[PDB]
Amino acid sequence: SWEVGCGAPVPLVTCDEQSPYRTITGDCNNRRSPALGAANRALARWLPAEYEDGLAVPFGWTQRKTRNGFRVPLAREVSNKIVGYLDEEGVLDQNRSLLFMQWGQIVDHDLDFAPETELGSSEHSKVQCEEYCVQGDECFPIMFPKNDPKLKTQGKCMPFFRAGFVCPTPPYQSLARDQINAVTSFLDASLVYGSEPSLASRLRNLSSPLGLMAVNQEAWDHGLAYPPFNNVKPSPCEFINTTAHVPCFQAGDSRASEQILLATVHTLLLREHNRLARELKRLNPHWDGEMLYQEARKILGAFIQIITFRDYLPIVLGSEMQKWIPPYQGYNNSVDPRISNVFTFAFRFGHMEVPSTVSRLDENYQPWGPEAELPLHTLFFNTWRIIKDGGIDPLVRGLLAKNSKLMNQNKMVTSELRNKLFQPTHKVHGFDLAAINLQRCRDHGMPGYNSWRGFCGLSQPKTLKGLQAVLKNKVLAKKLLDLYKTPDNIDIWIGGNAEPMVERGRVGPLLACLLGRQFQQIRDGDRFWWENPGVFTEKQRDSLQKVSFSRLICDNTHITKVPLHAFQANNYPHDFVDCSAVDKLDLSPWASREN
Ligand code: HEM
Ligand SMILES: *[C@@H]1O[C@H](CO)[C@@H](O[C@@H]2O[C@H](CO)[C@@H](O)[C@H](O)[C@H]2NC(C)=O)[C@H](O)[C@H]1NC(C)=O
Ligand SMILES: *[C@@H]1O[C@H](CO)[C@@H](O)[C@H](O)[C@H]1NC(C)=O
Ligand SMILES: *[C@@H]1O[C@H](CO)[C@@H](O)[C@H](O)[C@H]1NC(C)=O
Ligand SMILES: CCCc1cc(=O)[nH]c(=S)[nH]1
Ligand SMILES: [Ca+2]
């Protein structure tokens, strides 16, 4: 513990407190310590950072300094040697829908973002990074090992910039460098309304006191809306299809359009907002557009929070759920609702659930179109497919009917992601997320696998016979030790995901513990949590207890047949049923009798 903080977070804000609304920035959630949970501030450090210089230097950066007596293996090599796999045969989760994979990234984006640093624009310094792959300052290239096929096709490194950090943008001394978390730690739909007032505003429709969110002009989904277009260029969305010339979406989170399905749900969530703002004016026609806005925004929030804690997490967590998330017992102010720096690495167990393809299913859930099933790698920043081909409905059916990819040690991340990822400003569909995840753990200064085993009060294996036992996988261990000399150097992401999944869940014991407390801290520490008295009425809570993704789709698309359990893999037409048989959100409890 040194000092009271570091510079670069907005010095002064206000808290109306009497306001029964969340700020946009997340300030004023907590009267004791305002900035807690707030956007554009440092991620929380549950354990001390770890760097070659103990300050701002990532491990491996040096080429001589070894970690714990050994050099760290290149990210790209553990990815290839342990993470890669060819055969997509048999990798689907028999009981997890694609929706299952698709809510984690939605939730992930509500909760955190490490702003990646590229700094200036007029930059050849960017050219130095990718073309020549020059190490230095914030560029920190992932070199390819020998015998790396990409080698013959994309020079000798995948560019990779470090993550933003508190105080300077340049590194400093006398304190461990902390990465920034640009969104709000709370589960407050800040991936839809923004985390900066500036954005929140331009995101709204202010030309009508209807409390609506802004929607697109140039196009519609045969009646329904589409988020406005992110006006700035270049546009990775245009790049993928210059002919199409269709840009990315304007939404709270800046990552909204990374892959088609994500913008799919982002669209459903935006519709849901207006949908309410409309009905809130039907029942309460005496409110100002501001109120419509904040009430809808309030409502959309508990929804996210319900789906997430009620239906999502109990199956991600399984048997270690009620351990870390025993039923609600009140808003504990002494709780740090800040998102941990190592949580942002722990939640991307969500990558190993992403399957290689994405299909558009017709209104009878047979393949819509002749190119009905598409390769996932053609869907990064792909908005033209939605707009100029099908709309949201087709893709929403595949979300309900298609499976997610089950995690499996010999088959961890699909090539659409391992070899063919795409990245803005980069013109090639040749990126490795797995490697980026790894180069990332270092970039932040993550403690190694065993510091996290121990911290979670779990056996921290020292040996090879010691490791095998814990993953229950003989050769994954061998491979790991060969690549990572000792369990202590294994970068956490793969370390955490390398464990088998716990009873009924989809994550190993370590991630179970890392996630457990982080979600227990977003709730307990949320002054605006939908279940805490004050924030909602018993008549209102009652209503909120009825929501369902199924309903979400029914209210904001033209689908008709849906499954009662949107996540438990559902098959058609057996598991599917009509919208009428699906409970709705009664909006009666919000109405105000003016007299
Ligand atoms: C493409 C990508 C996805 C799907 C096709 C995808 C999916 C997920 C899910 C389902 C997650 C959680 C359940 C999840 C979490 C996080 N991701 Fe990931 N993701 C795709 C692509 C990316 C890319 C690119 C990044 C950037 C990584 C970097 O260091 O540059 C990425 C990150 C994350 C992440 C870290 C978030 C943060 O704190 O900034 C998750 C928690 N994903 N994804
Ligand atoms: C780029 O986007 C354009 C714009 O839609 C696409 O052109 C269409 O693609 C399919 C062809 O199978 C059908 O929509 C039409 O036959 C095409 N129309 C036009 C205007 O050509 C094109 O498919 C995309 N191609 C790339 C580079 O992805
Ligand atoms: C704002 O709302 C008005 C009133 O319905 C509507 O005419 C207009 O299209 C909306 N603008 C945006 C950008 O949503
Ligand atoms: C899927 O998981 C749920 C858990 O709620 C279970 O009840 C459902 O029956 C399961 N069905 C299948 C197809 O495994
Ligand atoms: C580290 C940045 C986080 C991130 C970016 C992105 O584009 N998609 C996802 S899921 N996460
Ligand atoms: Ca948030």
XYZ file of C-alpha atoms and ligand atoms in Angstrom:
706
model
C 0.000 0.000 0.000
C 1.600 3.254 -1.214
C -0.004 6.703 -1.597
C -3.696 7.437 -2.022
C -3.810 7.149 -5.814
C -2.588 8.255 -9.249
C -3.597 10.957 -11.745
C -5.745 10.998 -14.922
C -9.258 10.287 -13.563
C -11.758 13.120 -13.624
C -10.965 15.194 -10.497
C -14.492 16.252 -9.368
C -18.077 15.064 -10.078
C -21.400 15.294 -8.151
C -23.860 12.938 -6.501
C -27.522 14.022 -6.284
C -28.179 11.001 -4.025
C -31.852 11.875 -3.950
C -31.620 10.837 -7.588
C -32.956 7.292 -7.875
C -30.796 6.828 -10.906
C -27.316 5.609 -11.704
C -24.857 8.132 -12.996
C -23.453 7.175 -16.397
C -19.860 7.088 -15.182
C -20.746 4.908 -12.212
C -19.703 7.609 -9.767
C -21.929 8.184 -6.742
C -22.907 4.509 -6.396
C -21.036 4.616 -3.152
C -21.223 7.424 -0.706
C -18.253 6.264 1.336
C -15.848 6.239 -1.631
C -17.517 7.752 -4.748
C -15.242 6.607 -7.581
C -15.549 2.937 -6.544
C -16.884 0.932 -9.503
C -16.735 4.023 -11.719
C -15.536 4.047 -15.349
C -12.120 5.038 -16.728
C -10.376 4.203 -13.477
C -7.898 1.512 -12.510
C -8.944 -2.117 -12.458
C -8.619 -3.581 -8.946
C -5.473 -5.599 -7.967
C -6.459 -8.582 -5.829
C -2.785 -9.608 -5.805
C 0.354 -7.569 -6.508
C 1.321 -6.952 -10.125
C 4.319 -8.886 -11.459
C 6.837 -7.419 -13.911
C 10.508 -7.940 -14.913
C 11.246 -4.546 -13.354
C 8.466 -4.976 -10.829
C 6.951 -1.757 -12.179
C 5.897 -1.329 -15.791
C 7.754 -4.119 -17.647
C 5.958 -7.277 -18.914
C 7.591 -10.695 -18.613
C 9.363 -11.875 -21.761
C 9.873 -8.385 -22.988
C 13.630 -8.502 -22.267
C 15.038 -11.562 -24.126
C 17.420 -12.252 -21.234
C 15.533 -11.707 -18.048
C 13.900 -14.981 -17.290
C 11.009 -15.422 -14.888
C 11.725 -17.583 -11.835
C 14.828 -18.909 -13.503
C 13.344 -19.663 -16.899
C 12.399 -17.788 -20.004
C 8.738 -17.478 -20.683
C 7.450 -19.321 -23.749
C 6.194 -17.184 -26.621
C 2.432 -16.727 -26.585
C 2.064 -17.940 -30.149
C 3.784 -21.249 -29.318
C 1.637 -22.382 -26.365
C -1.329 -21.355 -28.526
C -0.117 -23.621 -31.361
C 1.218 -26.473 -29.221
C -1.592 -26.715 -26.638
C -4.498 -24.514 -27.745
C -4.880 -25.234 -31.469
C -7.006 -27.933 -33.090
C -8.234 -28.837 -36.613
C -11.179 -31.235 -36.349
C -14.414 -29.367 -35.488
C -16.106 -32.805 -35.327
C -17.842 -33.275 -31.992
C -17.050 -29.966 -30.257
C -20.607 -28.812 -29.581
C -22.065 -28.517 -26.075
C -25.077 -30.871 -25.997
C -26.757 -28.590 -23.427
C -25.565 -25.012 -24.003
C -27.044 -22.958 -26.777
C -25.055 -20.468 -28.807
C -27.027 -17.903 -26.775
C -25.118 -19.222 -23.739
C -21.788 -18.123 -25.304
C -23.422 -14.932 -26.508
C -24.488 -13.567 -23.117
C -21.086 -13.943 -21.522
C -19.477 -11.501 -23.921
C -22.517 -9.231 -23.467
C -22.117 -9.390 -19.752
C -18.367 -9.216 -20.086
C -18.718 -5.949 -21.999
C -21.079 -4.446 -19.530
C -18.506 -5.135 -16.808
C -15.081 -4.188 -18.162
C -12.794 -3.049 -20.898
C -9.036 -2.524 -20.995
C -8.659 0.257 -23.552
C -6.017 -1.000 -25.982
C -3.360 1.667 -26.747
C -2.385 2.784 -30.267
C -1.888 6.398 -29.206
C -1.266 8.797 -32.071
C -2.713 8.192 -35.564
C -0.247 9.837 -37.971
C 1.925 6.976 -37.093
C 4.717 5.033 -38.751
C 5.467 4.002 -35.186
C 2.493 1.750 -35.907
C 4.299 0.626 -39.045
C 7.374 -0.146 -36.959
C 5.274 -2.447 -34.793
C 3.549 -4.570 -37.428
C 5.843 -4.428 -40.451
C 9.239 -4.705 -38.715
C 7.791 -5.701 -35.312
C 9.987 -3.390 -33.250
C 9.705 -3.832 -29.458
C 9.483 -0.658 -27.395
C 7.354 1.591 -25.293
C 3.758 0.380 -25.696
C 4.117 -1.749 -28.833
C 4.916 -5.283 -27.639
C 4.908 -7.724 -30.559
C 4.067 -11.434 -30.440
C 6.825 -12.993 -32.501
C 6.144 -16.270 -34.264
C 8.242 -19.257 -33.255
C 10.103 -21.165 -36.004
C 8.010 -23.586 -38.100
C 5.158 -21.160 -37.687
C 3.230 -21.287 -40.938
C 1.918 -17.723 -40.540
C 5.613 -16.969 -40.675
C 5.720 -17.484 -44.430
C 2.610 -15.311 -44.876
C 2.661 -12.417 -42.361
C 6.239 -11.440 -41.595
C 7.577 -12.492 -38.201
C 5.131 -11.079 -35.633
C 1.558 -10.162 -34.855
C 1.500 -6.536 -33.798
C 0.245 -6.078 -30.227
C -0.123 -2.928 -28.248
C -0.174 -2.716 -24.456
C -3.254 -1.734 -22.441
C -4.009 1.730 -21.119
C -2.955 2.642 -17.584
C -3.457 5.082 -14.721
C -1.474 8.304 -14.526
C 0.654 8.546 -17.683
C 0.188 6.781 -21.016
C 3.956 6.285 -20.859
C 5.394 3.967 -18.182
C 6.430 5.302 -14.729
C 8.314 4.396 -11.529
C 7.647 4.290 -7.750
C 4.363 2.367 -8.182
C 3.062 -0.697 -10.033
C 1.385 0.215 -13.318
C -2.365 -0.333 -13.346
C -4.574 -0.835 -16.364
C -7.645 1.282 -16.851
C -11.219 -0.042 -16.998
C -13.163 2.237 -19.364
C -16.669 0.986 -18.550
C -18.545 0.828 -15.277
C -17.901 -2.147 -13.011
C -21.595 -2.426 -12.030
C -24.028 -4.578 -14.069
C -25.835 -1.466 -15.237
C -26.346 -1.786 -19.017
C -23.422 0.657 -19.582
C -22.740 -1.337 -22.773
C -25.955 0.176 -24.089
C -26.115 3.735 -22.661
C -22.387 4.387 -22.498
C -19.980 5.112 -19.656
C -19.223 8.701 -20.624
C -22.006 11.331 -20.472
C -20.755 12.740 -23.777
C -21.522 9.391 -25.401
C -24.679 8.707 -23.414
C -26.048 11.978 -24.741
C -25.235 11.544 -28.432
C -26.616 8.030 -27.972
C -30.009 9.321 -26.920
C -32.777 10.791 -28.985
C -33.044 14.339 -27.689
C -35.265 15.645 -30.515
C -38.408 14.250 -28.883
C -39.290 14.201 -25.185
C -39.946 10.445 -25.540
C -36.868 9.238 -23.623
C -35.882 7.093 -26.607
C -32.429 5.934 -27.619
C -31.186 6.973 -31.046
C -31.856 4.632 -33.938
C -30.738 4.292 -37.552
C -32.206 6.250 -40.461
C -30.723 4.602 -43.568
C -32.138 1.161 -42.735
C -34.683 -0.979 -40.880
C -35.423 -4.595 -40.103
C -38.744 -4.564 -41.871
C -40.328 -2.532 -39.092
C -37.817 -2.858 -36.300
C -34.842 -0.567 -35.581
C -31.056 -0.753 -35.827
C -28.561 1.189 -33.719
C -27.157 4.367 -35.314
C -23.874 4.056 -37.276
C -20.516 4.864 -35.693
C -19.709 7.813 -37.939
C -15.876 7.838 -37.565
C -13.457 6.367 -40.085
C -11.721 4.229 -40.799
C -14.424 1.664 -40.172
C -13.391 -1.986 -39.788
C -16.990 -2.706 -40.816
C -16.499 -0.954 -44.136
C -13.141 -2.559 -44.600
C -14.478 -6.070 -44.571
C -16.815 -5.085 -47.418
C -15.892 -1.841 -49.178
C -18.412 -2.726 -51.860
C -21.136 -3.033 -49.221
C -19.731 0.041 -47.530
C -21.651 -0.660 -44.308
C -20.256 0.790 -41.029
C -20.255 -0.400 -37.428
C -22.965 0.289 -34.853
C -23.244 3.190 -32.371
C -23.745 1.643 -28.948
C -22.615 2.054 -25.360
C -19.622 -0.252 -25.520
C -17.205 0.510 -28.373
C -16.811 -3.243 -29.050
C -20.512 -3.606 -29.979
C -19.939 -4.976 -33.496
C -16.864 -7.221 -33.162
C -18.888 -10.134 -34.402
C -22.335 -10.223 -35.960
C -24.174 -12.036 -33.109
C -22.959 -9.489 -30.516
C -24.450 -6.590 -32.518
C -27.441 -8.898 -32.827
C -28.068 -8.839 -29.086
C -26.943 -5.243 -28.854
C -29.819 -4.516 -31.283
C -32.355 -6.516 -29.213
C -31.251 -4.594 -26.070
C -31.611 -1.208 -27.778
C -35.062 -2.095 -29.086
C -35.988 -3.200 -25.589
C -35.181 0.313 -24.412
C -37.489 2.196 -26.686
C -40.085 -0.545 -26.364
C -40.331 0.438 -22.706
C -39.939 4.196 -23.184
C -43.014 3.813 -25.366
C -45.120 1.931 -22.827
C -43.920 4.060 -19.899
C -45.437 7.056 -21.737
C -48.654 5.127 -22.383
C -49.168 4.434 -18.676
C -47.340 7.505 -17.299
C -48.047 10.151 -20.025
C -47.139 12.955 -17.608
C -43.390 12.362 -17.441
C -40.520 14.247 -19.061
C -38.404 12.563 -21.721
C -35.687 12.496 -19.083
C -37.789 10.284 -16.805
C -38.809 7.993 -19.633
C -35.113 7.640 -20.364
C -33.990 6.891 -16.809
C -36.907 4.544 -15.992
C -36.386 2.497 -19.114
C -32.652 2.580 -18.471
C -33.411 1.461 -14.913
C -35.639 -1.384 -16.066
C -33.270 -2.605 -18.796
C -30.743 -2.816 -16.073
C -32.476 -5.192 -13.684
C -33.242 -7.377 -16.667
C -29.590 -7.796 -17.536
C -28.977 -8.469 -13.827
C -31.696 -11.102 -13.650
C -30.824 -13.054 -16.749
C -27.187 -12.995 -15.569
C -27.665 -14.064 -11.944
C -30.851 -16.107 -12.335
C -30.314 -18.084 -15.548
C -26.741 -17.581 -16.697
C -24.244 -17.885 -13.845
C -25.789 -20.866 -12.062
C -24.747 -23.016 -14.993
C -21.443 -21.321 -15.679
C -20.692 -21.767 -11.946
C -22.650 -24.957 -11.288
C -21.965 -26.526 -7.912
C -19.683 -23.706 -6.741
C -22.481 -21.173 -7.212
C -24.137 -20.958 -3.791
C -20.606 -21.022 -2.413
C -19.686 -17.650 -3.936
C -23.162 -16.405 -4.610
C -25.479 -17.487 -1.791
C -28.892 -15.741 -2.081
C -29.043 -11.947 -1.688
C -28.616 -10.433 1.772
C -28.336 -6.686 1.185
C -26.088 -3.908 -0.164
C -22.848 -4.016 1.737
C -21.113 -0.653 1.390
C -17.815 -2.109 2.750
C -17.658 -4.148 -0.489
C -15.351 -3.276 -3.392
C -17.548 -3.557 -6.500
C -14.561 -2.776 -8.655
C -13.744 -5.252 -11.367
C -10.491 -7.057 -10.742
C -7.694 -6.906 -13.310
C -7.395 -10.665 -13.252
C -11.155 -11.065 -13.653
C -10.922 -9.556 -17.122
C -8.643 -12.473 -18.004
C -10.779 -14.992 -16.122
C -14.025 -14.154 -17.930
C -12.549 -14.999 -21.316
C -13.114 -18.651 -20.693
C -15.847 -17.301 -22.982
C -13.503 -17.642 -25.964
C -13.255 -21.434 -25.657
C -17.021 -21.622 -26.083
C -17.124 -19.905 -29.438
C -17.821 -22.374 -32.321
C -16.404 -22.113 -35.847
C -19.673 -21.380 -37.690
C -22.767 -19.139 -37.413
C -26.037 -19.925 -39.209
C -29.127 -17.912 -40.248
C -32.247 -20.082 -39.767
C -35.560 -19.494 -41.660
C -38.972 -19.115 -39.956
C -39.204 -22.888 -39.779
C -35.663 -23.093 -38.534
C -34.358 -24.710 -41.656
C -31.384 -22.981 -43.335
C -32.365 -19.447 -44.437
C -30.673 -18.674 -47.761
C -28.187 -20.845 -49.742
C -25.169 -19.519 -47.829
C -27.221 -20.099 -44.690
C -24.266 -21.348 -42.632
C -21.235 -19.105 -42.580
C -17.665 -19.291 -41.264
C -17.258 -17.339 -38.049
C -14.085 -15.652 -39.289
C -16.103 -13.855 -41.963
C -18.204 -12.347 -39.239
C -15.777 -10.151 -37.342
C -17.020 -6.550 -37.709
C -19.576 -7.743 -40.194
C -22.636 -5.479 -40.227
C -23.382 -5.724 -43.931
C -24.621 -9.274 -43.470
C -27.283 -8.206 -41.009
C -28.356 -5.138 -42.960
C -28.031 -6.210 -46.572
C -28.938 -9.830 -45.874
C -31.643 -11.181 -43.589
C -32.004 -8.776 -40.681
C -31.858 -9.852 -37.025
C -34.498 -12.608 -37.020
C -32.546 -15.251 -38.965
C -29.484 -14.894 -36.716
C -31.601 -14.893 -33.543
C -32.980 -18.276 -34.410
C -29.483 -19.739 -34.768
C -28.803 -18.190 -31.389
C -31.679 -20.207 -29.948
C -31.124 -23.426 -31.899
C -27.417 -23.736 -32.452
C -25.121 -25.067 -29.751
C -22.079 -23.326 -28.279
C -18.693 -25.046 -28.514
C -17.963 -27.159 -25.466
C -14.560 -26.503 -23.910
C -12.166 -29.415 -24.333
C -8.461 -29.576 -23.424
C -7.349 -31.089 -26.759
C -9.689 -28.742 -28.568
C -9.593 -25.348 -26.830
C -9.970 -22.397 -29.249
C -11.317 -22.608 -32.790
C -9.204 -21.464 -35.719
C -11.717 -18.844 -36.694
C -10.173 -17.329 -33.553
C -6.779 -19.004 -33.185
C -5.496 -18.285 -36.694
C -8.107 -16.170 -38.466
C -9.066 -13.395 -36.038
C -9.459 -9.910 -37.419
C -8.476 -6.655 -35.828
C -9.441 -3.041 -36.639
C -6.839 -1.142 -38.692
C -5.278 -4.463 -39.567
C -6.241 -5.779 -42.947
C -5.710 -9.473 -42.358
C -8.019 -12.157 -41.019
C -4.975 -13.708 -39.395
C -4.928 -13.093 -35.688
C -4.558 -15.373 -32.703
C -6.865 -14.527 -29.798
C -5.342 -17.240 -27.632
C -1.891 -15.686 -28.082
C -3.289 -12.193 -27.561
C -4.907 -13.425 -24.313
C -1.481 -14.603 -23.169
C 0.513 -11.604 -24.337
C -2.190 -9.805 -22.403
C -1.765 -11.445 -19.025
C 1.874 -10.341 -19.090
C 1.021 -6.919 -20.436
C -0.988 -6.294 -17.269
C 1.503 -7.914 -14.939
C -0.538 -10.930 -13.936
C 0.728 -13.146 -11.164
C 1.224 -16.709 -12.370
C -0.982 -19.787 -12.219
C -0.042 -20.822 -8.679
C -0.340 -17.448 -7.083
C -3.940 -17.735 -8.263
C -4.334 -21.304 -7.152
C -3.121 -20.371 -3.699
C -5.005 -17.108 -3.456
C -8.118 -19.164 -4.177
C -7.088 -21.528 -1.428
C -6.446 -24.375 -3.839
C -3.596 -26.875 -4.110
C -0.727 -25.227 -5.991
C 1.060 -28.144 -7.716
C 4.832 -27.960 -7.916
C 5.522 -31.063 -10.004
C 4.642 -32.874 -13.224
C 3.107 -35.757 -11.317
C 1.670 -32.951 -9.227
C 0.047 -31.181 -12.194
C -1.373 -34.210 -14.010
C -3.386 -34.952 -10.894
C -5.036 -31.508 -10.897
C -6.075 -31.261 -14.568
C -6.758 -34.982 -14.725
C -4.970 -34.732 -18.072
C -1.606 -36.444 -18.477
C -0.295 -35.032 -21.741
C -1.802 -31.546 -21.373
C 0.371 -31.330 -18.268
C 3.506 -32.675 -19.942
C 2.918 -30.214 -22.795
C 2.427 -27.378 -20.344
C 5.558 -28.079 -18.343
C 7.545 -28.431 -21.570
C 6.277 -25.059 -22.745
C 6.067 -23.495 -19.280
C 8.963 -24.859 -17.195
C 7.011 -24.776 -13.914
C 3.317 -24.395 -13.006
C 4.157 -21.017 -11.493
C 5.052 -19.493 -14.856
C 2.053 -20.837 -16.762
C 0.183 -17.674 -17.686
C -3.165 -17.750 -15.813
C -5.709 -17.645 -18.677
C -4.662 -20.996 -20.154
C -3.759 -22.084 -16.647
C -7.291 -21.430 -15.462
C -8.971 -22.812 -18.586
C -6.657 -25.872 -18.641
C -8.490 -27.343 -15.652
C -11.486 -29.553 -16.276
C -14.957 -28.094 -15.695
C -16.553 -28.326 -12.267
C -19.762 -30.209 -11.471
C -22.597 -28.894 -13.624
C -20.643 -25.793 -14.728
C -18.269 -24.937 -17.591
C -15.161 -23.631 -15.813
C -12.460 -25.210 -13.670
C -12.143 -24.793 -9.879
C -9.814 -21.834 -10.191
C -12.039 -19.752 -12.465
C -14.991 -20.810 -10.355
C -13.385 -19.011 -7.436
C -12.095 -16.044 -9.445
C -15.549 -15.455 -10.971
C -17.483 -16.252 -7.824
C -16.198 -13.326 -5.776
C -16.227 -10.901 -8.678
C -19.942 -11.449 -9.272
C -20.581 -11.517 -5.538
C -18.875 -8.110 -5.457
C -20.833 -6.560 -8.338
C -24.143 -7.312 -6.596
C -23.449 -6.937 -2.919
C -21.663 -3.656 -3.722
C -24.278 -2.218 -6.060
C -26.331 0.491 -4.331
C -28.752 0.194 -7.246
C -29.070 -3.598 -7.368
C -32.649 -4.377 -8.361
C -33.342 -6.523 -5.279
C -32.247 -4.090 -2.559
C -35.288 -2.289 -1.087
C -35.606 1.319 -2.185
C -34.430 0.725 -5.755
C -37.656 -1.104 -6.597
C -41.163 -1.759 -5.234
C -42.359 -5.219 -4.227
C -44.999 -4.761 -6.930
C -42.213 -3.912 -9.371
C -39.738 -6.581 -8.293
C -42.601 -9.027 -8.641
C -42.895 -7.994 -12.280
C -39.162 -8.211 -12.936
C -39.011 -11.760 -11.617
C -40.891 -12.806 -14.782
C -38.512 -11.713 -17.570
C -36.861 -14.092 -20.031
C -34.524 -13.872 -23.015
C -37.236 -15.703 -24.840
C -39.508 -12.769 -24.081
C -36.863 -10.273 -24.993
C -36.819 -11.848 -28.472
C -40.600 -12.039 -28.671
C -40.969 -8.320 -27.862
C -38.199 -7.142 -30.170
C -38.122 -9.313 -33.303
C -40.651 -11.146 -35.483
C -39.760 -14.599 -34.203
C -42.748 -16.547 -32.916
C -41.401 -19.876 -31.659
C -38.965 -19.899 -28.741
C -37.672 -22.074 -25.882
C -38.570 -21.489 -22.221
C -34.924 -21.996 -21.226
C -33.003 -19.914 -23.760
C -29.664 -21.332 -22.528
C -30.224 -25.075 -21.970
C -29.646 -26.192 -25.579
C -33.106 -26.419 -27.157
C -34.169 -28.366 -30.205
C -36.951 -27.479 -32.637
C -39.838 -27.985 -32.965
C -39.967 -30.069 -29.785
C -38.446 -27.620 -27.292
C -39.923 -24.573 -29.006
C -43.275 -23.018 -28.108
C -45.173 -19.877 -29.130
C -44.541 -16.434 -27.611
C -47.968 -16.418 -25.975
C -46.960 -19.252 -23.638
C -44.020 -17.117 -22.448
C -44.464 -14.780 -19.485
C -44.290 -11.031 -20.029
C -43.066 -8.042 -18.050
C -46.200 -6.451 -16.589
C -45.668 -2.698 -16.874
C -48.655 -1.889 -14.653
C -46.571 -1.575 -11.424
C -44.714 1.474 -12.708
C -47.806 3.562 -13.559
C -48.405 6.709 -11.501
C -51.839 8.062 -10.560
C -51.253 11.820 -10.801
C -53.784 12.529 -8.016
C -14.481 -12.424 -31.527
C -14.737 -12.642 -30.044
C -15.738 -13.367 -29.445
C -16.783 -14.231 -29.968
C -16.866 -14.602 -31.232
C -15.526 -13.213 -27.988
C -16.351 -13.833 -27.051
C -16.261 -13.649 -25.688
C -17.097 -14.206 -24.687
C -18.259 -15.128 -24.926
C -16.649 -13.723 -23.466
C -17.112 -13.973 -22.095
C -18.005 -14.920 -21.815
C -15.565 -12.902 -23.772
C -14.899 -12.237 -22.849
C -13.847 -11.441 -23.142
N -13.235 -11.234 -24.316
Fe -13.778 -11.847 -25.981
N -14.462 -12.446 -27.816
C -13.993 -12.042 -28.975
C -12.897 -11.225 -29.170
C -12.171 -10.626 -28.176
C -11.050 -9.777 -28.388
C -10.411 -9.381 -29.713
C -10.602 -9.388 -27.182
C -9.435 -8.456 -26.933
C -8.319 -9.092 -26.092
C -7.071 -8.236 -25.994
O -6.304 -8.211 -24.985
O -6.773 -7.507 -26.950
C -11.456 -10.016 -26.241
C -11.387 -9.822 -24.921
C -12.290 -10.358 -24.057
C -12.244 -10.042 -22.609
C -11.303 -9.076 -21.951
C -12.211 -7.823 -21.795
C -11.488 -6.618 -21.266
O -11.384 -6.532 -20.037
O -11.028 -5.688 -21.970
C -13.256 -10.714 -22.038
C -13.716 -10.771 -20.584
N -12.392 -10.765 -26.854
N -15.336 -12.865 -25.104
C -19.660 -7.338 -50.199
O -20.899 -6.754 -49.970
C -21.670 -6.702 -51.157
C -22.886 -5.830 -50.886
O -24.017 -6.572 -50.488
C -22.060 -8.116 -51.536
O -22.683 -8.155 -52.815
C -23.783 -9.084 -52.817
O -23.513 -10.415 -52.350
C -24.441 -11.521 -52.485
C -23.921 -12.411 -53.596
O -24.021 -13.792 -53.263
C -25.822 -11.040 -52.853
O -26.196 -10.112 -51.871
C -25.701 -10.169 -54.079
O -25.677 -11.083 -55.165
C -24.507 -9.219 -54.143
N -24.929 -7.930 -54.551
C -24.058 -7.088 -55.049
C -24.423 -5.647 -54.913
O -23.050 -7.456 -55.580
C -20.868 -9.041 -51.611
O -21.373 -10.345 -51.465
C -19.866 -8.815 -50.525
N -18.660 -9.383 -50.985
C -17.654 -9.368 -50.159
C -16.380 -8.821 -50.678
O -17.751 -9.744 -49.043
C -36.277 10.591 -32.274
O -37.661 10.457 -31.958
C -38.490 11.079 -32.938
C -39.940 11.048 -32.470
O -40.516 9.774 -32.787
C -38.330 10.357 -34.271
O -39.108 11.025 -35.271
C -36.869 10.323 -34.702
O -36.723 9.451 -35.828
C -35.976 9.839 -33.565
N -34.581 10.010 -33.924
C -33.673 9.077 -33.650
C -32.293 9.339 -34.176
O -33.946 8.074 -33.012
C -30.275 -28.920 -19.881
O -30.002 -28.322 -18.599
C -31.143 -28.063 -17.739
C -30.733 -27.532 -16.374
O -31.734 -26.608 -15.915
C -31.974 -29.340 -17.618
O -33.143 -29.295 -16.810
C -32.452 -29.612 -19.000
O -33.351 -30.666 -18.898
C -31.251 -30.095 -19.728
N -31.702 -30.704 -20.939
C -30.813 -31.277 -21.711
C -31.225 -31.381 -23.136
O -29.742 -31.680 -21.302
C -9.407 -6.396 -23.993
C -10.563 -5.767 -24.776
C -11.874 -6.521 -24.608
C -12.713 -6.980 -25.777
C -12.680 -6.446 -27.064
C -13.548 -6.972 -28.032
O -13.538 -6.473 -29.291
N -14.406 -7.982 -27.734
C -14.403 -8.492 -26.493
S -15.480 -9.754 -26.086
N -13.592 -7.991 -25.530
Ca -21.211 -1.390 -16.478
